[PDB]
Scaffold this active site. Structure first.
Site, PDB file in Angstrom:
ATOM      1  N   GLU A 174      -2.601  13.730   2.190  1.00 56.82           N
ATOM      2  CA  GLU A 174      -3.809  13.258   2.919  1.00 56.82           C
ATOM      3  C   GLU A 174      -4.532  14.450   3.526  1.00 56.82           C
ATOM      4  OE1 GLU A 174      -2.710   9.438   5.116  1.00 56.82           O
ATOM      5  OE2 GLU A 174      -4.017   8.930   3.325  1.00 56.82           O
TER       6      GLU A 174
ATOM      7  N   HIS B   3       4.869  10.712   6.412  1.00 57.86           N
ATOM      8  CA  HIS B   3       4.397  10.404   7.761  1.00 57.86           C
ATOM      9  C   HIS B   3       5.533   9.684   8.538  1.00 57.86           C
ATOM     10  CE1 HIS B   3      -0.038  10.445   6.316  1.00 57.86           C
ATOM     11  NE2 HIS B   3       0.381  11.666   6.524  1.00 57.86           N
TER      12      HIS B   3
ATOM     13  N   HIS C 242       0.867  -1.221   0.000  1.00 56.35           N
ATOM     14  CA  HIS C 242       0.000   0.000   0.000  1.00 56.35           C
ATOM     15  C   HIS C 242       0.905   1.276   0.000  1.00 56.35           C
ATOM     16  CE1 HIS C 242      -0.231  -1.324   4.218  1.00 56.35           C
ATOM     17  NE2 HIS C 242       0.149  -0.038   4.574  1.00 56.35           N
TER      18      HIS C 242
ATOM     19  N   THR D  64      -4.535   6.620   8.971  1.00 49.07           N
ATOM     20  CA  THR D  64      -5.252   6.955   7.764  1.00 49.07           C
ATOM     21  C   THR D  64      -5.525   5.722   6.918  1.00 49.07           C
ATOM     22  OG1 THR D  64      -3.325   7.707   6.677  1.00 49.07           O
ATOM     23  CG2 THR D  64      -4.611   9.399   7.817  1.00 49.07           C
ATOM     24  N   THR D  65      -5.034   4.560   7.380  1.00 49.89           N
ATOM     25  CA  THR D  65      -5.355   3.313   6.633  1.00 49.89           C
ATOM     26  C   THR D  65      -5.939   2.360   7.688  1.00 49.89           C
ATOM     27  OG1 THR D  65      -3.381   2.248   7.129  1.00 49.89           O
ATOM     28  CG2 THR D  65      -3.335   3.598   5.127  1.00 49.89           C
TER      29      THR D  65
ATOM     30  N   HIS E 150       2.560   8.976   1.048  1.00 51.01           N
ATOM     31  CA  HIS E 150       1.250   8.912   0.351  1.00 51.01           C
ATOM     32  C   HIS E 150       1.517   9.896  -0.824  1.00 51.01           C
ATOM     33  CE1 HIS E 150      -0.855   6.984   3.627  1.00 51.01           C
ATOM     34  NE2 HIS E 150      -0.034   7.780   4.389  1.00 51.01           N
TER      35      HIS E 150
ATOM     36  N   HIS F 287       6.840   6.694   6.001  1.00 52.59           N
ATOM     37  CA  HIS F 287       6.273   6.260   4.672  1.00 52.59           C
ATOM     38  C   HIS F 287       5.661   7.519   4.094  1.00 52.59           C
ATOM     39  CE1 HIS F 287       2.843   5.786   7.430  1.00 52.59           C
ATOM     40  NE2 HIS F 287       2.225   6.383   6.425  1.00 52.59           N
TER      41      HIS F 287
HETATM   42  N1  LIG Z   1      -3.630  -7.138  18.441  1.00 49.09           N
HETATM   43  C1  LIG Z   1      -4.057  -7.454  17.029  1.00 49.09           C
HETATM   44  C2  LIG Z   1      -3.672  -6.199  16.189  1.00 49.09           C
HETATM   45  O1  LIG Z   1      -3.840  -6.126  14.984  1.00 49.09           O
HETATM   46  N2  LIG Z   1      -3.050  -5.088  16.891  1.00 49.09           N
HETATM   47  C3  LIG Z   1      -2.463  -4.148  15.950  1.00 49.09           C
HETATM   48  C4  LIG Z   1      -1.850  -3.065  16.681  1.00 49.09           C
HETATM   49  O2  LIG Z   1      -1.936  -1.850  15.946  1.00 49.09           O
HETATM   50  C5  LIG Z   1      -2.071  -2.208  14.558  1.00 49.09           C
HETATM   51  C6  LIG Z   1      -2.143  -1.004  13.692  1.00 49.09           C
HETATM   52  O3  LIG Z   1      -1.865  -1.412  12.318  1.00 49.09           O
HETATM   53  C7  LIG Z   1      -0.421  -1.507  12.133  1.00 49.09           C
HETATM   54  C8  LIG Z   1      -0.089  -1.070  10.744  1.00 49.09           C
HETATM   55  N3  LIG Z   1      -0.257   0.364  10.446  1.00 49.09           N
HETATM   56  C9  LIG Z   1       0.476   1.315  10.922  1.00 49.09           C
HETATM   57  O4  LIG Z   1       1.348   1.011  11.716  1.00 49.09           O
HETATM   58  C10 LIG Z   1       0.184   2.643  10.479  1.00 49.09           C
HETATM   59  C11 LIG Z   1       0.926   3.673  11.005  1.00 49.09           C
HETATM   60  C12 LIG Z   1       0.640   4.978  10.596  1.00 49.09           C
HETATM   61  C13 LIG Z   1      -0.414   5.308   9.703  1.00 49.09           C
HETATM   62  S1  LIG Z   1      -0.690   6.828   9.180  1.00 49.09           S
HETATM   63  N4  LIG Z   1      -0.915   6.668   7.760  1.00 49.09           N
HETATM   64  O5  LIG Z   1      -1.834   7.417   9.778  1.00 49.09           O
HETATM   65  O6  LIG Z   1       0.519   7.519   9.548  1.00 49.09           O
HETATM   66  C14 LIG Z   1      -1.130   4.224   9.137  1.00 49.09           C
HETATM   67  C15 LIG Z   1      -0.878   2.895   9.536  1.00 49.09           C
HETATM   68 ZN   LIG Z   2       0.485   7.567   6.316  1.00 45.75          ZN
END
Ligand SMILES: NCC(=O)NCCOCCOCCNC(=O)c1ccc(S(N)(=O)=O)cc1
Ligand SMILES: [Zn+2]
Ligand SMILES: [Hg+2]
Length: 256
Positions: free
Chosen positions: A103, A116, A61, A195-196, A93, A91
């Site tokens: 975003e 980000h 992504h 944001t995802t 976008h 990362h």
């Molecule tokens: N305990 C089961 C479980 O899935 N726990 C997960 C803990 O937190 C998971 C969050 O998803 C991890 C992957 N995504 C990211 O780390 C992540 C980080 C930053 C942003 S953004 N775009 O907002 O900066 C978007 C996504």
């Molecule tokens: Zn991001």
């Protein structure tokens, strides 16, 4: 699964992640005339002299540059934050065109891309725990505008060929993030979310006023990446951004 296509795009995310329609989503439009100047807001403190980058990975992504966060190596403090936040990854976008990609928007203006820098509050012990708290994460957002090349970004741009499809990774040591920061640390801040998917509402957003400029050619390389894995139909990794979400009574504070 979720993506940015017409069949699995942001408009569909609410089906598998109902929080998509929560009260603190992200990204939002920053209405600069409605943003509140908060004099009680402290200046940001970015300590990245000690940052240890490890690798870069195409996760299907976006591409992520991961850092060693087993210690207070590269941290963020001050600003609207209380305690230390450790950098875990950065990362971007970006869009299919120079006129879209960011975003967050400023007075409805869209930038070519958005950087980000993701950090997690050390009081929670691990990243997994930080994502279960309302003050769990802090994301530093930096807009990219097309102009002059960014010297500091070139190292990333050159490795992109090596992680063209989803699942590929390359060693990526000795990358200094300080090369990606604008001159000024003036910012807007508001309570938001990832944001995802899973769109968790654990983020304190710190959006820098001043954009960094990158060249046309630097941006073009980003768009050569694939959403797909090796040996699958080719799908260009472009427009991996989510539209602005309702502020819903939240207040955007300005440090300036
Ligand atoms: N305990 C089961 C479980 O899935 N726990 C997960 C803990 O937190 C998971 C969050 O998803 C991890 C992957 N995504 C990211 O780390 C992540 C980080 C930053 C942003 S953004 N775009 O907002 O900066 C978007 C996504
Ligand atoms: Zn991001
Ligand atoms: Hg949370």
């Amino acid at each position: 699964h979720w993506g940015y296509g017409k069949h699995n795009g942001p408009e569909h995310w609410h089906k598998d992640f109902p929080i998509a329609k929560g009260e603190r989503q992200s990204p939002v439009d920053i209405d600069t005339h409605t943003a509140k100047y908060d004099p009680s807001l402290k200046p940001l403190s970015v300590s990245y002299d000690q940052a240890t980058s490890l690798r870069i990975l195409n996760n299907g992504h976006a591409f992520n540059v991961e850092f060693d966060d087993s210690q207070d190596k590269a941290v963020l403090k001050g600003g609207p934050l209380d305690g230390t936040y450790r950098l875990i990854q950065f990362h971007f976008h970006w869009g299919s065109l120079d006129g879209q990609g960011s975003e967050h928007t400023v007075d409805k203006k869209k930038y070519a891309a958005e950087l980000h820098l993701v950090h997690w509050n050390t009081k929670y012990g691990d990243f997994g725990k930080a994502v279960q708290q309302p003050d769990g994460l802090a994301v530093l957002g930096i807009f990219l505008k097309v102009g002059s090349a960014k010297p500091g970004l070139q190292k990333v741009v050159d490795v992109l060929d090596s992680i063209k499809t989803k699942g590929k990774s390359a060693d990526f040591t000795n990358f200094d993030p300080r090369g990606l920061l604008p001159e000024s640390l003036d910012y807007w801040t508001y309570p938001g979310s990832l944001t995802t998917p899973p769109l968790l509402e654990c983020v304190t957003w710190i959006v820098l006023k001043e954009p960094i400029s990158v060249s046309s050619e630097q941006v073009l390389k980003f768009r050569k990446l694939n959403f797909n894995g090796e040996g699958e139909p080719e799908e260009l990794m472009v427009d991996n951004w989510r539209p602005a979400q309702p502020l819903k009574n939240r207040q955007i504070k300005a440090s300036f």
